[PDB]
């Protein structure tokens, strides 16, 4: 009935906004301090803010229906009509997208195949390319359920059609900022990550995408707020909070030393305190430990 956290080394957890495991762990007083993410968000109560899915596989994947036309004009493009990945149709609501939809400005490179239904079917694959950023060349608007994915300099004259399933594989010109969810209008989003006491730095679990460029590759690092195990643990247990905060302790397990004192707040993040300038990492073999609720304004312990 008291809260508990999974005894799992953070180096052994899936990620939230991109399906690949965790590598680093670091605080940062330089980067934008007020992110407004919409994946990997959860109340320690056990509800799901934003568009957070439940599985891991459901991340940055959308199902849809595929249909073409040739008037544009911008190349041989396709028009998808979003539906929820389980199979049930999609009817607009409060969340600004179906479950599990990418939320970072850039230009993906998806891989799309035929939604399987039973053994012995026939499958076909392609490789589209979809823009998400603040570029209103095409009317990009998932809220209504309409996206415009192009076709790459592909092969296979016979394209795909019907019920499909898209899974991301790349990035290009990445930029950590929300896409245009509606065509310029507003949508009910998750609020920012605030507020913070003086001398406050979030804690960020960091992963590594693969950022394509001209005939080469390069890794680029995208963060989140919590690994996916916390999401799929809270969202199931549904504890009952007591006040406002919850103090933790990053505790190595080889010896039993201490590494910092981080406050698991109530709206789904793990604040710290750190007064330096550059970015500083930690090891990734620790194990968290719940200690005790406290008030919000509880003074911190300056790490260095």
């Amino acid at each position, epitope marked *: 009935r008291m809260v508990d956290l999974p005894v799992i080394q953070p180096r052994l957890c899936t990620h939230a906004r991109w399906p690949a495991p965790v590598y680093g762990l670091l605080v940062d007083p330089s980067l934008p301090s007020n992110p407004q993410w919409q994946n990997g968000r959860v109340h320690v109560d056990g509800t799901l803010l934003g568009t957070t899915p439940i599985s891991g596989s459901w991340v940055s994947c959308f199902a849809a229906e595929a249909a*073409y036309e*040739f*008037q544009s004009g911008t*190349g*041989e493009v396709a028009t998808f009509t979003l539906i929820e990945q389980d199979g049930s149709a999609y009817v607009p609501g409060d969340r600004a997208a179906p479950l599990g939809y990418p939320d970072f400005s850039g230009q993906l490179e998806i891989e799309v195949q035929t939604e399987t239904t039973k053994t012995g079917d026939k499958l076909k694959v392609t490789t589209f390319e979809m823009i998400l950023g603040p570029t209103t060349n095409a009317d990009q608007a998932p809220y209504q359920g309409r996206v415009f994915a192009s*076709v790459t*300099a592909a*092969a296979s*004259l016979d*394209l795909v*059609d019907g019920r499909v399933r898209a899974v991301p594989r790349s990035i290009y010109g990445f930029q950590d900022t929300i896409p245009e969810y509606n065509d310029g209008l507003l949508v009910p989003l998750a609020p920012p990550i605030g507020p913070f006491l003086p001398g406050e730095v979030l804690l960020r679990f960091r992963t590594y995408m693969r950022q394509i460029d001209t005939a080469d590759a390069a890794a680029e690092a995208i963060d989140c707020a919590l690994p996916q195990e916390f999401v799929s643990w809270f969202a199931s247990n549904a504890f009952t909070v007591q006040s406002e905060a919850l103090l933790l302790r990053y505790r190595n397990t080889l010896t039993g030393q201490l590494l910092f004192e981080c406050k698991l707040y109530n709206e789904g993040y793990i604040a710290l305190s750190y007064s330096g300038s550059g970015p500083l990492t930690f090891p990734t073999d620790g194990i968290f430990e719940v200690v005790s609720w406290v008030p919000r304004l509880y003074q911190l312990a300056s790490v260095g």
Partner: antibody
Amino acid sequence: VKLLESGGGLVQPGGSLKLSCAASGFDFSRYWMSWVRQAPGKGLEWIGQINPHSSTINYTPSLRDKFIISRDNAKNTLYLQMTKVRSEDTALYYCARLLRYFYALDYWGQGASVTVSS
Amino acid sequence: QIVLTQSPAIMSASPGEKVTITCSASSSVSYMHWFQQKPGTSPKLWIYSTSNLASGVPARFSGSGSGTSYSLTISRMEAEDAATYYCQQRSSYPFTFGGGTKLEIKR
């Protein structure tokens, strides 16, 4: 969205020729292409098709060994190559900008007139 | 290796009438296309997937049929509907065009 050809003229039996279909006004390095011929009189006839990567190239079963299709993305042109040309293979030659899902050869050039002669 | 047959080879009519053109099949197919070549001009796409209209055609025309027999019909003819019409099938094999038929004015 405008094409053109060159290389039409006169050749002798057994000879060889290089038709050059040039294009302008669109992303020529993204669309498939094809060639079709019309003998004076009789109806149309398919030659084959070539994708952008030159990966796969489909020829009609007959008369494969006499035609070599290729392209160049840099200079933005397309080449057809005839070898050991015979006398029966005189016609008009067109280069179409084939389309992706519905095959639908949509935009055609102007016409290359090829005639064998002595 | 499918061969097609267009019938009739040549046929005419007068404006205001409805004409039909059949392009049969030697084997089961699934789609056909139609082209229009006025003399001294490169052909042009007219009707694809047996039922749709190209970019810039008057809505008089009509494509239908299924199975192994397709046909193209106009509602009312005109003076700008005189040219050879070809049927192509993008079904399964080395593609093939039909023999092609003509359609001209009756005076």
